[PDB]
């Protein structure tokens, strides 16, 4: 499918950025988990990243540290994540939809059949966290025999040759990284630095969603106009859910007020 | 691109976040760097001579084998200062810090011993050290935590995950993906990313140097085998490496068979684990069917854990070593033997290599055997361990 070619071509027909929260699948059970990304999705989230519960996930500060834990803590297991994807897409044909993955998850009983997964419940791309570009060969191969974007990192001081193998190797979007470090909203990135963002441009990368660290509107503006295509935000999203566990009903309008001023922040 | 192969066969690499290959990179080149320089071997000597006390001796062990046609010497890593071999990777991996301008330096634990290794070593060099250890090994080892404390080191308990070893190296990575530029990562086995388990490895290769000169010189050939415990395998390669070509000598590691392979309670990955990818490496591990990573288990701290350095995974695939397990019983009937016969109180990490080595004679008790069993450390630590279960019988 070509889900975040479309969107893109939509939002630059609108001259707007991509608003993208994360969150992870089936924290903090699998029904609210269904109920707060429909919620996400009506608010106006342009595309999801999703998170696979896993028992290490070492590129994640506590907030989704601790969503990995609730998720657990409700017996959720990839079997039944990739149960959720399935209905998601049966609901919402259209919207991308992003897994964010450690490389067990997706090797441990064959790579190809992981992406193959993939393909069948219609999921559009897969980040490997723990796979820099250098590891990437077998993930990006057998992502795209499947039609599954196979995202990559940019970090902030990423040299030429690095942005060259971003920009060859990935589809769907690029990553760009706001700082070093992990996921959380208690560390603020950087303004994307022009250099990055036209240099992926020169080389003809797929445009670019910043994140770690996106916690408020003025992020997201500022990140569209320094020409990235749109914004990532976890934790912040991820936060509203810790904070309201006791409350399904005040999570889910939290969760719409927020992903709504963030939606609006990408508008031109 | 690497200077060196992160590969051990299909074993190794470097599968980290993007984030830390910078960091990964430049501790390569700065190690190749290193091994070329011989003001920083000179260094990296005189503090394994003149702090530590190396060359450590070779023991023979008489008592024990007695009516056999074994011949058993113990290499006394035991003897080094910390009183376990972590000392000798701890001095270079400080020395490299030092060499790259960082300042500090941050370590995984779950035994306790490299935490203490690593805070003495930075006491020694200067460095400000921070330690990582999960929050039930916090509880169960208090007078290494109070130890690291005393060198100077902040000891971090770590409560994600299952609040053990693997989850105080996921800190120590998500740490230094945020403090690279001024703080080394003093990874604590031969295993991890690359060049992880290349440094350690060539930074305790002196184990079976001295072994290999020690034996020459005692009994004019090569032993028949080099046994040694696999935790992560720092000291079973720091015994193997400098006998790898030499193609007589037997390579064999043992890992820790807990209450018994069958039970499941067990830390032996190499032989009854599934290849897999985590802490920075393609290699076995215990893993649930759908790929989580398992609690390993067993009765000895530095043993525990649910993966293995990825040379050992080769060696083994290869034939060139093999690998075999121990019990908890086992290790345990192994220590009072030692304490009881030769007045040497081993490690129970140690006890699983002389557990095996003990098999290996009672076994075959005419088969003419010429062994080497690592000690990798000393069992001070472990009294009360051994105090608490011969309680019961
Ligand atoms: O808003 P924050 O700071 O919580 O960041 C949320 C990010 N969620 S994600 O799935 O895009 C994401 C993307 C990349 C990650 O690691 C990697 F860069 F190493 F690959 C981890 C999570
Ligand atoms: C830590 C430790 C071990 C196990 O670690 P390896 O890296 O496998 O050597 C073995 N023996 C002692 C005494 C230890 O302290
Ligand atoms: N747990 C032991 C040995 C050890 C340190 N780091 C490790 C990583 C993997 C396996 C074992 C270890 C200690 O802390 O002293
Ligand atoms: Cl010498
Ligand atoms: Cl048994
Ligand atoms: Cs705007
Ligand atoms: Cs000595
Ligand atoms: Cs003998
Ligand atoms: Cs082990």
């Known amino acids: 499918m070509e889900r975040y070619e479309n969107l893109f071509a939509q939002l630059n027909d609108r001259r707007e950025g991509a608003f993208v929260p994360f969150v992870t699948l089936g924290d903090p059970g699998i029904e609210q988990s269904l109920k707060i990304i429909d919620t996400l999705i009506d608010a106006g989230a342009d595309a999801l990243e999703l998170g696979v519960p896993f028992s290490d996930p070492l590129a994640d500060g506590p907030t989704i540290q601790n969503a990995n834990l609730r998720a657990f803590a409700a017996g959720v297991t ?10 998601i897409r049966e609901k919402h044909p259209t919207i991308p939809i992003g897994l964010l993955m450690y490389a067990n998850l997706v090797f441990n009983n064959g790579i190809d059949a992981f992406y193959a997964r993939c393909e069948q419940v219609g999921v559009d791309s897969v980040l490997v966290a723990d796979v820099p570009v250098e590891e990437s060969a077998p993930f990006r191969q057998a992502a795209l025999r499947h039609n599954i974007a196979p ?31 992990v996921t959380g909203a208690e560390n603020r990135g950087a303004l994307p630095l022009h250099h990055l963002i036209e240099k992926l441009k020169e080389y003809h990368a797929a445009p670019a969603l910043q994140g770690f660290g996106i916690s408020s509107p003025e992020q997201v503006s500022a990140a569209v106009r320094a020409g990235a295509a749109g914004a990532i935000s976890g934790s912040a999203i991820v936060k509203i859910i810790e904070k309201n566990l006791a409350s399904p009903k005040q999570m889910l309008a939290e969760l719409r007020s927020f992903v709504s001023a963030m939606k609006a922040a990408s508008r031109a | 691109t690497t200077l060196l192969n992160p590969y051990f066969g299909e074993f190794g690499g470097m599968y980290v976040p993007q984030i830390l290959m910078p960091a990964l990179n430049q501790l390569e080149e700065a190690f190749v760097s290193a091994q070329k320089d011989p003001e ?24 024990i084998t007695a009516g056999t046609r074994t011949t058993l010497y113990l290499k006394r890593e035991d003897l080094l200062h910390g009183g376990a071999h972590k000392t000798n990777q701890v001095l270079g991996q400080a020395l490299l810090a030092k060499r790259m301008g ?25 460095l400000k050290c921070r330690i990582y250890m999960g929050a039930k090994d916090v509880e169960r080892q208090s007078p290494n935590v109070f130890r690291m404390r005393l060198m100077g080191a902040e000891v971090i308990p770590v409560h994600s995950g299952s609040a053990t070893l693997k989850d105080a190296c996921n800190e120590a990575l998500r740490d230094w993906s945020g403090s690279y530029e001024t703080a080394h990562y003093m990874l604590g086995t031969a295993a ?32 028949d ?9 720092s000291n079973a390669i720091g015994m193997f490496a400098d006998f ?69 995974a080769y060696l083994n695939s290869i034939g060139r070593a093999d690998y075999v397990s121990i019990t908890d019983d086992e290790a345990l009937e192994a220590f009072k033997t030692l304490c009881r016969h030769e007045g040497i109180i081993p490690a129970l990490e140690s006890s699983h290599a002389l557990a095996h080595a003990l098999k290996m004679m009672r076994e075959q008790p005419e088969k ?24 019961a019988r």
Do not use: W
């Open chain 1, 78 to 87: 990839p079997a039944q994540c990739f149960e959720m994807l399935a209905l």
């Open chain 1, 151 to 181: 995202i990559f990192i940019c970090p902030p001081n990423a040299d030429d040759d690095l942005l060259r193998q971003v920009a060859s190797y990935g589809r769907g979007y690029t990553y760009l990284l706001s700082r070093s470090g």
């Open chain 2, 40 to 63: 920083f071997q000179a260094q990296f000597a005189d503090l394994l001579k003149n702090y530590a006390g190396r060359p450590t001796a070779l023991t023979k062990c008489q008592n």
């Open chain 2, 102 to 126: 960082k300042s500090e330096i941050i370590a995984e634990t779950g035994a306790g011993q490299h935490g203490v290794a690593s805070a003495l070593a930075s006491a020694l060099l200067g």
């Open chain 2, 192 to 223: 991890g990313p690359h060049p992880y388990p290349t440094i350690v490895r060539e930074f305790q290769r002196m184990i079976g140097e001295e072994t290999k000169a020690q034996i020459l010189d005692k009994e004019g050939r090569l032993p």
């Open chain 2, 225 to 233: 085998a080099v046994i040694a415990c696999v935790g992560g395998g």
């Open chain 2, 244 to 312: 790898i070509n030499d193609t007589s000598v037997g390579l064999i590691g043992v890992e820790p068979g807990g209450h018994g392979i069958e039970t499941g309670e067990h830390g032996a990955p190499l032989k009854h684990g599934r290849v897999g990818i985590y802490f920075g490496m393609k290699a076995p591990m215990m893993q649930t069917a759908d790929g989580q990573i398992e609690e390993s288990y067993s009765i000895s701290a530095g043993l525990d854990f649910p993966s293995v350095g990825p040379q050992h």
């Open chain 2, 368 to 391: 003419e055997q010429l062994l080497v069993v690592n000690l990798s450390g000393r069992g001070d630590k472990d009294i009360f361990t051994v105090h608490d279960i011969l309680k």
